[PDB]
Amino acid sequence: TATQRLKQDYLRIKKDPVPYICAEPLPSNILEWHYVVRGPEMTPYEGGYYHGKLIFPREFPFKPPSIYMITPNGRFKCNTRLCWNPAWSVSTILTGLLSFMVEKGPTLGSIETSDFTKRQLAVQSLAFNLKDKVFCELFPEVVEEIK
* Residue 144, C-beta contacts closer than 8 angstroms, at least 6 positions apart: none
Q: How far apart are the first and last CA of the chain?
A: 39
Amino acid of residue 136: C
**Pairing, β 49-55 against β 66-69:** antiparallel
- Confirm if 127 and 101 have CB atoms less than 8 A apart: no
- Confirm if 73 and 118 have CB atoms less than 8 A apart: yes
Is 83 in the active site? yes
DSSP 42: T
Quote the CA–CA distance of 55 and 120 in Å, as a whole number.
28
Of 22, 78, 83, 136, catalytic:
83
Name the residues annotated as catalytic. Answer: 83
